[PDB]
Amino acid sequence: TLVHVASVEKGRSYEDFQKVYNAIALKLREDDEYDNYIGYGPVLVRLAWHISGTWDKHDNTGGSYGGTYRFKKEFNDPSNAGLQNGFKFLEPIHKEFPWISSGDLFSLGGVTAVQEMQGPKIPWRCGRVDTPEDTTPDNGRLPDADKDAGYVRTFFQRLNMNDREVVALMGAHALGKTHLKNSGYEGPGGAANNVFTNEFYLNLLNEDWKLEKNDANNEQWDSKSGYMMLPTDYSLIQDPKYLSIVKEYANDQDKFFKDFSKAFEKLLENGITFPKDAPSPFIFKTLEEQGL
């Protein structure tokens, strides 16, 4: 069995990590022009997810622990096209705080982004430890977007996620947009794409979606409002079990926030064993809460 035990960066405590959070948050505020004024929040959330979503529950390969996205096999995964922008954003942060591990930095970037975009608090734990280049997972473990609900359910079971966790996590697609050159899909999902809300679910249910091909010859669902849904997004209103949960979150943002926060922490921690004397999870203050 392959076990990864969280090991706190030597001598570091909550306050040290809050300083890293603050540096990420200050740079997020500064770099507001990125991606036609969306800012870096969405791509940092996607980075935190993609470095975690290589995990395989069966043998504990992949996952956030090892920080392996720093190695070219993983950095160059076609599934990760565009994430280099997030890595480049985090580079000056890592320079300022060289003591933090890569997996801790990448995952903390996603937590910081969600919170600074007015999302829920996401508890976060330190202690991911960089592992060598030969531990980098092969490409092909991240999901395809052209597929249906059965594919989504099966995929997420590899990450030990159930229906509620899947539907909650997908709500992150309120953020950012698809970019044709990255993924072969184009467009935002709504008007509020750098503030964290339940808009994904509302737009899934309330827009009039039309199936179209895009300029890369791929099918996607488009609305007159200029929004889009991936086939895997749209699958959440095709499957009866997913549809029930989509309606729940469309009706109740507080419940979505609570479930997202739990699922996202779980995603970022998959594969990691936290020893009993490990610090409790940290809840970082936003810049606003600190007067910064």
Footprint on this chain of ligand HEM (rule: CB under 6 A): 42-43, 45-46, 49, 82, 143, 145, 152, 169-170, 172-173, 175-179, 182-183, 185, 230, 232, 264
Burial bucket for residue 196 (CB in 10 Å: 0-12, 13-18, 19+):
buried
Instruction: Say if CB 222 and CB 209 are below 8 A apart.
Output: yes
In the complex, least distance from residue 278 CB atom to ligand HEM, rounded to whole angstroms: 24
Q: Would you say 97 or 156 has its CB closer to ligand HEM?
A: 156
Which residue, judged by CB position, is nearest to ligand HEM in the bound state?
Answer: 176
Instruction: Say if CB 279 and CB 15 are below 8 A apart.
Output: no
Q: Where are the beta strands (DSSP E) in 138-262?
A: 177-178, 187-188, 209-213, 219-223, 228-229
In the complex, least distance from residue 97 CB atom to ligand HEM, rounded to whole angstroms: 24
In the complex, least distance from residue 45 CB atom to ligand HEM, rounded to whole angstroms: 4
Q: Would you say 230 or 272 has its CB closer to ligand HEM?
A: 230
In the complex, least distance from residue 142 CB atom to ligand HEM, rounded to whole angstroms: 8
Q: Would you say 97 or 234 has its CB closer to ligand HEM?
A: 234
What does the block give as tokens for 167? 């539907």
Q: Please name which of 85, 74, 89, 127 lies closest in space to residue 277, comparing C-alpha atoms.
A: 127
Q: Is 201 left (phi over 0), alpha (psi -120 to 50) or beta?
A: alpha
Q: Would you say 8 or 112 has its CB closer to ligand HEM?
A: 112
Q: Would you say 47 or 129 has its CB closer to ligand HEM?
A: 47
Q: To which residue do tokens 């982004």 refer?
A: 113
What does the block give as tokens for 227? 């929004």
In the complex, least distance from residue 13 CB atom to ligand HEM, rounded to whole angstroms: 28
In the complex, least distance from residue 12 CB atom to ligand HEM, rounded to whole angstroms: 26
Q: Would you say 8 or 152 has its CB closer to ligand HEM?
A: 152
- Cα separation, 127 vs 186, in Å, equals 37
